[PDB]
Symmetry: C2
Subunit: 142 residues, 2 copies
């Protein structure tokens, strides 16, 4: 049912994170490589999802794209300035089992960046836990 459907990505993400950290070579946690691994995997998956489907583009990230991955829409899309958006998820699926949380946000930052890349957009995407398990993703167009 929906409960199992809503767990599938969390379970797979948990394996990705655990395995990247467990399998890290000497110095790769400390030098940021575990992070780039997670962001780069997210990028490829984001690209791939797009292949199966500026403000209009961002609402699609917030709605159809978020719903595919997380079974719900983004709670709030805000943009204060040309080229920078804040996407707020009030109960971020991947944190529902809890600086040390950043590793659980990296893959998703990549997902958003990859989806945008294949729509012709260069971006930087960062994230922070607002109040566990709420999260804000900051999308910065380049």
């Amino acid at each position: 049912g929906s409960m199992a459907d809503e767990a599938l990505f969390l379970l797979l993400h948990n394996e990705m994170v655990s395995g990247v950290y467990k399998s890290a070579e000497q110095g790769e946690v400390e030098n940021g490589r575990c992070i780039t691994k997670l962001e780069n995997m997210g990028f490829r998956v984001g690209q791939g999802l797009i292949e199966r489907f500026e403000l209009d583009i961002m609402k699609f990230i917030c709605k159809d794209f978020w719903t595919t991955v997380f079974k719900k829409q983004i709670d709030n899309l805000r943009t204060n300035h040309q080229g920078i958006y804040v996407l707020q998820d009030n109960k971020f699926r991947l944190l529902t089992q809890m600086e040390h949380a950043s590793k659980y946000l990296a893959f998703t930052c990549g997902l958003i960046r990859g989806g945008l890349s294949n729509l012709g957009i260069k971006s930087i995407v960062t994230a922070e836990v607002s109040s566990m398990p709420a999260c804000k993703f900051q999308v910065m167009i380049q």
Copy 2:
């Protein structure tokens, strides 16, 4: 749409397989450790999914009912379709045929996690099993479940 909905799993599985093999240490391909990693990851995900289905007496009644659940509700969770054919000898061997296995649309590395999935699912339903797989005629695949 549904095209994307099926796709998420395939894409994540591609990443898992790629990563295990890219990250493999000296001797881990040859000694079978890449395969056990993928089976073990699948086992854990399969267990986790079981925990998210509602249980009652009649669900998972007899062994064949548990097997039909694996073929239907469980398979659909992951692959967005059911197993095409379930065969048993009723003496502990089941063969699950997927005529168009979505991860295929060297084979071993692409079946390991799914073997693990099945086993972990069954484990959390009280069943000890060994699960093996082969490509019958690409992209058709057969999963053999042997109840211990």
